Amino acid sequence: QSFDLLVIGGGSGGLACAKEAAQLGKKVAVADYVEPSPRGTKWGLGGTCVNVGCIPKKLMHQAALLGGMIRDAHHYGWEVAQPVQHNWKTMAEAVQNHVKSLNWGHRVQLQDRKVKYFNIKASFVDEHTVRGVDKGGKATLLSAEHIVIATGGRPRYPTQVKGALEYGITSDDIFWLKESPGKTLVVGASYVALECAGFLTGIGLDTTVMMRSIPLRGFDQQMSSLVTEHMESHGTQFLKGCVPSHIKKLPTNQLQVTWEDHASGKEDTGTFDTVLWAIGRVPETRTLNLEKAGISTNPKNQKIIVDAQEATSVPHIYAIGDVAEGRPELTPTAIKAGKLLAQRLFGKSSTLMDYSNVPTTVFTPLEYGCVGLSEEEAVALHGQEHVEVYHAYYKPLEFTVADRDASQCYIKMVCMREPPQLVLGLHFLGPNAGEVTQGFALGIKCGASYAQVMQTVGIHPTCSEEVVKLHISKRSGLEPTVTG
Amino acid sequence: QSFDLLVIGGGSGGLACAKEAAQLGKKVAVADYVEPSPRGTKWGLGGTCVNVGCIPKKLMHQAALLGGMIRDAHHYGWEVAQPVQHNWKTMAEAVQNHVKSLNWGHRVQLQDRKVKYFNIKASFVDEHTVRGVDKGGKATLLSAEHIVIATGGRPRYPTQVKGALEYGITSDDIFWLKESPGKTLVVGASYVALECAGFLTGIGLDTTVMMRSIPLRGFDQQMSSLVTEHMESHGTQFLKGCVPSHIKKLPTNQLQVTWEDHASGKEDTGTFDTVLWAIGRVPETRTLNLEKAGISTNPKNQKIIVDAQEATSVPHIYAIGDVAEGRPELTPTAIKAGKLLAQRLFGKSSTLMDYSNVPTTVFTPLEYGCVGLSEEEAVALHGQEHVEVYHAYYKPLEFTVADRDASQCYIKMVCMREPPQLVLGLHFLGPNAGEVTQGFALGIKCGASYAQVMQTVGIHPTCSEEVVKLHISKRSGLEPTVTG
Ligand SMILES: Cc1cc2nc3c(=O)[nH]c(=O)nc-3n(C[C@H](O)[C@H](O)[C@H](O)COP(=O)(O)OP(=O)(O)OC[C@H]3O[C@@H](n4cnc5c(N)ncnc54)[C@H](O)[C@@H]3O)c2cc1C
C-alpha cells in the first residue's frame, strides 16, 4: 500500500535512512532484493556491507592475521605445535553464521521501528510508485511522497574474456563458498583484489594476483606500491602487467586461464582452481526503469546523478551510496548520508553531508590507512614549491621479538610548506591502520597544523605514536628510517 | 674532564637531551649508573623505559595477548592443538635479548654523536662539578656549564611490612627473572600493578592482585573500574581492600603473606611463590647531595622543584622526567622535554614543553586509553550543569567470531554542554587503546568540537570508528549499548 517514505535497497545506506526516518515518527517502508550472483549465490537483508564485503572480508582478513599471530606466538614463549593447519570450512561457517546474525538482526531493528519490509525486485512505474517482482511473482502497489534510492552496485565482469561468467567467481561468491578456493587467480589491482588476495594467501592458498596496470590507482602511489611489495614479499604470487583473454575449463575441471604478459612475453598459460574478478563494481540502475520515472542519470558510470542534498532531478526523490554519482563508495558515508538525509526531510535539519577528507583503510596483509591528500594530489593542488612532507620508517615493538620483517612499515604526512603548516593528508602503513588513522582524520576536519603535531605528545610504546614523531622532511632528503 | 653539557641519567629523557644537544654541535657528556635492585638485579644503559618498563612490559603484555590470539584462532579455522603451553624461559630470553638490542643501541648512538659516556654513580660536589663513584672506585673530575638532571626514580618499598625487602620483588625484577614467577601476589592498585598482574595472568600463572583502596586513583574512576572488572572476569584473582603486614618465608621457600581484609575479616593468610610491590616509585635525589649544590627540592615527593623552562634554582642547572616535580611521569614527555630543553639552550629555540592533554594508555588485559579530562575532573572544572558526555558499549568485529566477551568494551567522550561543544577528554577501553587514542589526542591539541566529530566520517569496520559514532548522552540517560 502507501507510505510517506519508500526506500529501495535494504543496504547500509538505505536501512540507515529508513530506521532514522522512522525514528522521526514517519511511516517508513523499504524494499530490498538480493538478485543472485552469476554463479547462483544469494544472501539475506543488509546490502553488500553485511553480506559480501565490509564484515566478511575483515573477518577473513582477521583469520589470516591470526595465522601470523601463531607463528609470532612461538617467539613469545608459546610452544604452539606447528605448522598449524586451517580449514576453509570452519572459517567460512563461523563468518557466515555471523553475517546471518546481522541478517536476522537488521530484520529485528526494522520491526521494533514501525517499518515494513517488502522483499521485492523494485522497479519504477512513475513519479510516486514502484512495481515489485517476487521470488513468486506477485507485484505490489507501493507509493510514497519521498523515495530514497540505495541500490548500490554489483561486481563488474570482463567483456570479451570468454570463459568468464562460465567459471569466473566474484567477491559475492568467495565469501559464501562451501569448499576452499584451493588455488586461485585474482584479476584486479585495487581494493577488492588485493584484500581478497591477501587473506587467501594468509590462509595458505596458492594465491596469484594479475594486475594489468598500476596498483590502487588513485591512492598515493608510493604507499600503493609499498603495499603490494609487502604482499609479494610475503607469499602472494604477482603477475605484473597481464590481462585475461580466455579461460578454458578442462577435464579435472581446473581452469586453464590464458593471458598476455605485456611486461615481457606475449601470452602465457597457467591453471588454477578458482578465478576471482576484482575489476570494479557497477550500479544496478538499469533494472529500475529510472528513465520512466524522471530520474536523470550519468553516462559513463550509470550512477544516479545527484544534488548536494542527495536529491535527484525529481526533488522528492533522492539517491544514496554506491548509487549516487560523485560520492565515495564507502559504508560510513553511505550510512551517515542516510541519517542526515532522513533528518533534513522530517527532522528540521539543514546540515548536509560533508564528503571531504573521509578516511579509509585498505585491509591488505599490511593495512594501509589514509585521510586527506596523497603527495601527488597535494602538489597537484598547491604545487611542489608550496608543500612539505614528513615521513618515517618504523618498527612495531611487537614486530621485534617475533622476527616479523617491517621494511614495509612506512608513514607519510603531507602538509603545506608555510607555517603553521596545515596537515592535509596522512598515510599510515602498518598494523591496524584504521584504528590509527581514525583519530587523525579528526585532526583534518579540524585543520590541525604540523605544529600541533610537534605539540602533541606520544603514547609510548605504540605504532600510532610514530605519526606524532615525524620530522624528517623530503625537502631535506634525509634518511627516513628512525633511530633512538 | 670538562664538557659544556653534563647529563645525569642515561635515560629516556636524559639521552634525548644529550643526543639532541650534541646534534646542536655541543660537547655533550652523560653519566648513568644502574644501582642494582634490592634483590640484586642490574641492567644496561637506557633508563627505566628500555630496561624495566615501557619496552619489556608491552612485550610481555604482547605475549599474553598472543595467548588469547591462539584461543580465538580456533574459531577462525585454525586447527591449533590446545591447550598450548608457554614457558617463562623462552619469553624472558626473547624480551631481554631485545632490551639489550636497545642497550648496545643507545651506546652506539652516543658514539656516532660526539658524546662521551661515563658510567658513574654521580653526586653533586658544587655548582659546576660532580663526583663519580665506580664499580671499581675511581672518582672522576666532571664539570660543565649546563647540567641536566634526569635520574628518574626507583620502585618504592613497604615500610613496617616485615618480610618485604627480604622476599619482595619489584618491577625491576619481574622482567629479568631467570625462572617463572610461578604463583604471585601483586600488592598494588594502579598502572604497574594491574599491567604486570595482567600479562602474568595471560601467561597462565595463578596471579592475585591486592588493592588496599581504589583502582588507578586519579583516572576516570568509571573507566578504572571497568578495567579491573575485565581482569577479574578473565582469570585475575582479586583481594579488594587488603593490606600487607607480614611475609614469612617457609621451608619450601614459599612466601607466607599475611594481610588484613578491611572489607570483611580482619586478617587472612595465603602463600605464593613471588610477591610484587607495585606501590609507586621514588626519586633518586637523595643520593646526589643536591643540597650541597644549591638545588632546592620538594618536601612530600623528593622530586627536584622546577621551572617552566625545566630550570631549577640554579639557572644553569635543569631537571627532566620522573625527577622534576609537577611533570607527568611518562616517557614521551621525558623525551620531548629533553629535546626542547636542548634546543632552547643551544638552538635559539623559545618554545617550551606543553604538558597538557598528554595522552596515555594503561596496557592492561583490556587496554585503557585516554586524553584530556575524566568525567569527574570535568564537572570539577566546569560544573555538571555545563558538561555533556557521550558514551558507548561496542563489540569489536574481531571479538565476534571468536566468542570473546566484550561487555567491558566501553567508550566515553567528555566535552562541554554548550556548542560547538569542545571535546576535552576521551576515554577508550578496548583493543589497542593507544593506537586509537593517539590520533584523537590531536583533536584535543586542536580543540576539536563534538560537531567536528559528527562531521568526521568513519573507517569501517574498526574499533576507533565507534568513537566518531558516539551520540547517546548521559543527560538523556539512554541505553549505551550500540545497535545497527
Ligand atoms: C569485498 C568488499 C569489501 C568492502 N569493505 C569495505 C570496508 O571495509 N569499509 C567500507 O567503508 N566499505 C567497504 N566496502 C564498500 C561498501 O560495502 C559499499 O560502499 C556500501 O555497501 C554501499 O552501500 P549502499 O547502501 O549504497 O548499497 P548496497 O549495500 O550495495 O545495498 C544495495 C541493496 O539493494 C539491493 N537492490 C539493488 N537493486 C534493487 C532493486 N531494483 N530492487 C530492490 N533491491 C535492489 C541489492 O541487491 C542490495 O541488497 C566493501 C565492498 C566490497 C565489495
Ligand SMILES: Cc1cc2nc3c(=O)[nH]c(=O)nc-3n(C[C@H](O)[C@H](O)[C@H](O)COP(=O)(O)OP(=O)(O)OC[C@H]3O[C@@H](n4cnc5c(N)ncnc54)[C@H](O)[C@@H]3O)c2cc1C
Ligand atoms: C613497569 C613500568 C612500565 C612503564 N610503561 C610505560 C609506558 O608504556 N609508556 C610511558 O610513556 N611510560 C612508561 N613508564 C614510565 C617511564 O618509563 C618513565 O616515566 C621514564 O622512564 C622516566 O624517564 P627519566 O629519563 O626521567 O628516568 P629513568 O628512565 O628512570 O632513567 C634514570 C637513569 O639514571 C640513573 N641514575 C639515577 N640516579 C643516578 C645518579 N645519582 N648517578 C648516575 N645515574 C643515576 C638510573 O639508574 C637510570 O638508569 C613505565 C614505568 C614502569 C616502572
Ligand SMILES: NC(=O)C1=CN([C@@H]2O[C@H](COP(=O)(O)OP(=O)(O)OC[C@H]3O[C@@H](n4cnc5c(N)ncnc54)[C@H](OP(=O)(O)O)[C@@H]3O)[C@@H](O)[C@H]2O)C=CC1
Ligand atoms: N574501504 C575499504 O576497505 C574497501 C572499499 N571498497 C570499495 O569498493 C570499490 C570496488 O573495489 P574494486 O572493484 O577493487 O575497485 P575499483 O577501485 O572498483 O576497481 C579498480 C581496479 O579494477 C581493475 N580493473 C578494471 N578493469 C579491469 C580489467 N578489465 N582487467 C583487469 N583489472 C581491471 C583496475 O585496474 P586499473 O586501475 O588499471 O584500471 C583496478 O585494479 C572500491 O573502489 C571501494 O570504493 C572495496 C574494498 C574495500
Ligand SMILES: NC(=O)C1=CN([C@@H]2O[C@H](COP(=O)(O)OP(=O)(O)OC[C@H]3O[C@@H](n4cnc5c(N)ncnc54)[C@H](OP(=O)(O)O)[C@@H]3O)[C@@H](O)[C@H]2O)C=CC1
Ligand atoms: N604509561 C603507562 O602505560 C605506564 C606509566 N607508568 C608510570 O609509572 C608510575 C608508577 O606506577 P605505579 O607505581 O603503579 O603507580 P603510582 O601511580 O606510582 O602508584 C599508585 C598505586 O600504588 C598503590 N599503593 C601506594 N602505597 C601503597 C601501599 N602502602 N600498599 C598498597 N598499595 C599502595 C596505590 O594505592 P592508592 O591509590 O590506594 O594510594 C595505587 O594502586 C605511574 O604512576 C606512571 O606515571 C607505569 C606503568 C605504565
